[PDB]
Amino acid sequence: LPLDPLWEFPRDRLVLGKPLGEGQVVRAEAFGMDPARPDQASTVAVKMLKDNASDKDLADLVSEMEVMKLIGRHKNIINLLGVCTQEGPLYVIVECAAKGNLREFLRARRPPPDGPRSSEGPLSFPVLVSCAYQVARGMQYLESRKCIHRDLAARNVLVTEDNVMKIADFGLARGVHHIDYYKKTSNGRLPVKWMAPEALFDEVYTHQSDVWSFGILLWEIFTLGGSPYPGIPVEELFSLLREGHRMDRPPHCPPELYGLMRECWHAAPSQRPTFKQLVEALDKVLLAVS
Numbered sequence: 542l543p544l545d546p547l548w549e550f551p552r553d554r555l556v557l558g559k560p561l562g563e564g565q566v567v568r569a570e571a572f573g574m575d576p577a578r579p580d581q582a583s584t585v586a587v588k589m590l591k592d593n594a595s596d597k598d599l600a601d602l603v604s605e606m607e608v609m610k611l612i613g614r615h616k617n618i619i620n621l622l623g624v625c626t627q628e629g630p631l632y633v634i635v636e637c638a639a640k641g642n643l644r645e646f647l648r649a650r651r652p653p654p655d656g657p658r659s660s661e662g663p664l665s666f667p668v669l670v671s672c673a674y675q676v677a678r679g680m681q682y683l684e685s686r687k688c689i690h691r692d693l694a695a696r697n698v699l700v701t702e703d704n705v706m707k708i709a710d711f712g713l714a715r716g717v718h719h720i721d722y723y724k725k726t727s728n729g730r731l732p733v734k735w736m737a738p739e740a741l742f743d744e745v746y747t748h749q750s751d752v753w754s755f756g757i758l759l760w761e762i763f764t765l766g767g768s769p770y771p772g773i774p775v776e777e778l779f780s781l782l783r784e785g786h787r788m789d790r791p792p793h794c795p796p797e798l799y800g801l802m803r804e805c806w807h808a809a810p811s812q813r814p815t816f817k818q819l820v821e822a823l824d825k826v827l828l829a830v831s
């Protein structure tokens with residue numbers, strides 16, 4: 542690979558730490574990511590190939606690198622910090638999100654008797670709305686750069702130490718012509734439950750397909766990390782989607798938010814809100830509840 546001086550970062554300024562998940566992602570310390578503070582430490586996440594990697598895996602990581610170079614920076618996405626391409630393995634260095642993904646963030650903070658605050662869990666309605674608003678802003682940014690995520694879900698939204706939402710894994714080759722719809726992950730996720738019907742049935746992806754997935758994500762937020770289509774296996778999901786099935790309104794979810802969910806799941810993609818409209822609708826709610 543050729544040297545791109547805009548992005549190249551010396552690999553000896555990285556100290557790799559414990560893995561985060563699986564290419565594979567490992568936490569690391571970086572020294573001098575800001576060239577004005579060359580000895581300053583920061584914590585970053587490093588994407589790299591697995592040991593068993595094929596040349597297709599390498600081309601996929603290179604392609605994700607190139608996408609991330611072109612996407613530019615935004616507060617509500619995981620941003621590219623640097624790359625290591627010379628004289629060693631390929632590393633793509635990105636922001637680290639210290640609280641992990643939004644699904645695990647919410648599930649760990651579900652509401653609960655000593656003291657005056659015993660009924661009070663960590664999550665409040667305005668902060669849930671803010672999480673949704675920040676994801677919509679991130680997606681509005683990605684859309685403006687012509688990026689379709691294709692698997693927007695709470696597990697692909699990461700949370701920083703300051704509760705900033707950052708969309709992750711938006712630049713990936715997703716193998717859309719060879720999806721195993723019955724695939725269950727090691728944590729029990731069925732990713733087909735986030736796919737818009739035009740994507741699932743017709744292999745068509747647009748920004749409006751991401752809007753459908755955003756509606757599923759909204760339902761995940763207001764169930765505090767619930768799994769969508771409760772109890773419905775994939776075979777039944779296909780039949781229910783052909784019949785126009787939609788999820789019920791979650792408990793303790795105001796009708797403004799369930800209304801937004803149902804708009805995101807309108808059958809016609811043109812009848813779903815845009816991300817610009819979702820940003821505006823969620824900002825109105827967020828401002829009203831301060």
Ligand SMILES: *C(=O)c1nc(NC(=O)Nc2cc(O[C@H](C)c3c(Cl)cncc3Cl)c(C#N)cn2)c(OCCN2CCOCC2)cc1CN1CCN(C)CC1=O
Binds near residue numbers: 568696710
């Ligand atoms: C660095 O800020 C950091 N990060 C995490 N967690 C984390 O997930 N960071 C992360 C992951 C990531 O992509 C991976 C593949 C991923 C994962 Cl692991 C899970 N779901 C989706 C995805 Cl897409 C990217 C990218 N791109 C960026 N950042 C972290 O953790 C700690 C353990 N924990 C926390 C959340 O609940 C469950 C697990 C820790 C850190 C840095 N810190 C902070 C605290 N100190 C004490 C230790 C530490 O290493």
